[PDB]
């Protein structure tokens, strides 16, 4: 009655409470609107992670076509991901004091 167990997930996932808290804790923390956060987590768009020397933005959202198009001219430092790992990596790249 008083001991629990755990489950090792094969892929990281986001908490629905903080995702739809009204206001969303994830949303206003990264300055990213909730409109596209739902598409990123549900694997429906892409987000930039450490773009580097390119014409991209830190947290710019781009579709599948824009993902393939940008990959043609920039495929060395370009790095975009989708899902909860993309936002998780974005969370670790964020800073508090700055």
């Amino acid at each position: 009655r008083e001991r629990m167990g755990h489950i090792e997930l094969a892929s990281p996932t986001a908490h629905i409470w903080f995702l739809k808290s009204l206001p969303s804790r994830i949303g206003l923390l990264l300055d990213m609107p909730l409109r596209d956060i739902e598409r990123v987590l549900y694997f429906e768009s892409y987000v930039v992670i450490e773009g580097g020397m390119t014409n991209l933005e830190r947290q710019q959202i781009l579709t599948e076509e824009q993902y393939l198009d940008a990959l043609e001219e920039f495929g060395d430092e370009f790095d975009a991901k989708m899902g909860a790992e993309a936002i998780q990596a974005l969370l670790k790249s964020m800073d508090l004091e700055q």
């Binding site: 009655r1 008083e2 001991r3 629990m4 489950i7 997930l9 094969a10 892929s11 996932t13 986001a14 908490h15 629905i16 409470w17 739809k20 987590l41 549900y42 694997f43 989708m82 899902g83 909860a84």
Partner: protein, 97 residues
């Protein structure tokens, strides 16, 4: 813990299993599928959606019905998530505290 989510030991073989145990069963199903799907090195188009299926399975486990179409039971009755047992008039506070 299992004592906090037991079954219904009625007279018979069938069991009106708790909505939480059904939810935990689905998450393990959707997780063992994804655990095997990655060792096989399946195409991303399958892994991408299957992680979304796992994503929409954990959301129902935590707070079902808040995102969108609530995962129902057999035909119509929705299932009680972990939030429903604490939120509302039938939660632990307003019913047992």
């Amino acid at each position: 813990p299992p004592d906090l989510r037991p079954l219904v030991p009625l007279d018979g073989g069938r069991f009106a299993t708790s909505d939480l145990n059904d939810l935990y069963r689905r998450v393990i199903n959707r997780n063992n599928r994804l655990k095997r799907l990655l060792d096989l090195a399946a195409p991303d188009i399958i892994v991408r959606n299957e992680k979304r299926m796992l994503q929409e399975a954990v959301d129902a486990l935590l707070d079902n019905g808040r995102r969108g179409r609530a995962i129902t039971g057999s035909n119509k009755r929705p299932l009680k998530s972990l939030a429903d047992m604490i939120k509302g008039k039938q939660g632990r506070f307003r019913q047992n505290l």
